[PDB]
Amino acid sequence: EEYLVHALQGSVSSGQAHSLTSLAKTWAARGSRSREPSPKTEDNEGVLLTEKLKPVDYEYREEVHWATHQLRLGRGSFGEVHRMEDKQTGFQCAVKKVRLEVFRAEELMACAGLTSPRIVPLYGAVREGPWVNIFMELLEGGSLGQLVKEQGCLPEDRALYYLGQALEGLEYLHSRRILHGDVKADNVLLSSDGSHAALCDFGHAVCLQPDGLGDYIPGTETHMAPEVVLGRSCDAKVDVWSSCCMMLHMLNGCHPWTQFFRGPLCLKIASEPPPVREIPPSCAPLTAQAIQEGLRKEPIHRVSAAELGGKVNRALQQVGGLKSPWRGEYKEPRHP
Ligand SMILES: Nc1ncnc2c1ncn2[C@@H]1O[C@H](COP(=O)(O)OP(=O)(O)OP(O)(O)=S)[C@@H](O)[C@H]1O
Numbered sequence: 100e101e102y103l104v105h106a107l108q109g110s111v112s113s114g115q116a117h118s119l120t121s122l123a124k125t126w127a128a129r130g131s132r133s134r135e136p137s138p139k140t141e142d143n144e145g146v147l148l149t150e151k152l153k154p155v156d157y158e159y160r161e162e163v164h165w166a167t168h169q170l171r172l173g174r175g176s177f178g179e180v181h182r183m184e185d186k187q188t189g190f191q192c193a194v195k196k197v198r199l200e201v202f203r204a205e206e207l208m209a210c211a212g213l214t215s216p217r218i219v220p221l222y223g224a225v226r227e228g229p230w231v232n233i234f235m236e237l238l239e240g241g242s243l244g245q246l247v248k249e250q251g252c253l254p255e256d257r258a259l260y261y262l263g264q265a266l267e268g269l270e271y272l273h274s275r276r277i278l279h280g281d282v283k284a285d286n287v288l289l290s291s292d293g294s295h296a297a298l299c300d301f302g303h304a305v306c307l308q309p310d311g312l313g314d315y316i317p318g319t320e321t322h323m324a325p326e327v328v329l330g331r332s333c334d335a336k337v338d339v340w341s342s343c344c345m346m347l348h349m350l351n352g353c354h355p356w357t358q359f360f361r362g363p364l365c366l367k368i369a370s371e372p373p374p375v376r377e378i379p380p381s382c383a384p385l386t387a388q389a390i391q392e393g394l395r396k397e398p399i400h401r402v403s404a405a406e407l408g409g410k411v412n413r414a415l416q417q418v419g420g421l422k423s424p425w426r427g428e429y430k431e432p433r434h435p
């Protein structure tokens with residue numbers, strides 16, 4: 100690895116996941132470093148995983164070999180995301196811009212090389228000094244979070260449908276010993292037609308060591324599982340808890356806890372019963388039952404992503420499949 104990395108450094112190369120991953124480890128180390136003076140030559144290095152993004156003489160600089168266009172797609176706690184165009188190939192994709200000082204190699208490790216349709220393909224990453232750029236398929240339907248905001252709430256059938264696809268994605272991750280670390284609506288991306296969903300945002304991902312146990316800071320407070328808050332050992336079940344919080348979010352048009360408690364929520368999530376009281380009463384028995392098994396406080400008793408995927412698939416059948424329209428009528432969220 101050490102020899103490989105040395106070769107990659109200073110250059111933007113076409114290559115494969117492991118190369119990107121190995122280089123990304125060096126980036127995390129440099130982000131921790133003390134403030135230094137800017138040199139005259141700003142380091143430009145990375146690797147791209149598709150020939151639709153082409154370096155030129157081992158360089159890939161914004162406003163030279165590529166550019167952003169139009170308004171921002173979105174911004175989370177760590178990165179701004181834009182549409183982009185490669186000036187050589189004309190290819191369009193998304194860029195997530197992250198400062199080196201907050202970057203984590205795991206964000207790439209957790210999705211470079213993967214090939215689930217429920218996970219955004221990673222196209223590569225290059226850095227211009229402290230500016231990290233992460234390239235990935237552009238999805239024109241926005242985030243599930245944006246949809247929930249627009250529509251107010253989602254119908255039970257849309258909610259079940261998307262939760263199911265998320266769990267397909269989590270099962271793929273979990274079987275590869277990857278924890279997503281921040282499952283929520285804002286980190287699920289949609290097609291133009293709203294038919295396909297894919298997980299994004301591996302900024303809080305951790306690579307579960309062969310043990311299958313974890314380092315792990317959670318991404319979003321409202322979606323934290325009790326075992327996390329209690330500071331105990333964490334596994335993939337953490338994600339299924341999160342997915343059920345996202346489920347509640349879609350149904351009620353608001354995160355769990357929020358309407359009832361003022362932060363911090365660590366105390367509450369640990370102290371209180373799981374927020375199954377926030378399951379709408381109008382929900383079908385199989386929906387309520389899935390959400391309840393996913394919000395078991397003891398992770399050992401909590402269902403796996405695969406197990407829950409089954410339950411929610413059947414619950415969708417019970418409500419009579421995906422009938423509701425895409426971008427339908429507004430639904431008033433639960434009020435406090
Ligand atoms: N590939 C993409 N295509 C379209 N929109 C995207 C894409 N990636 C991200 N977005 C949007 O940009 C937002 C922020 O991107 P994220 O990757 O979630 O960044 P982030 O939330 O800062 O990451 P964390 O907090 O470090 S896990 C998402 O909520 C989406 O709305």
Ligand SMILES: [Mg+2]
Pocket residue numbers: 175176285286300
């Ligand atoms: Mg995000």
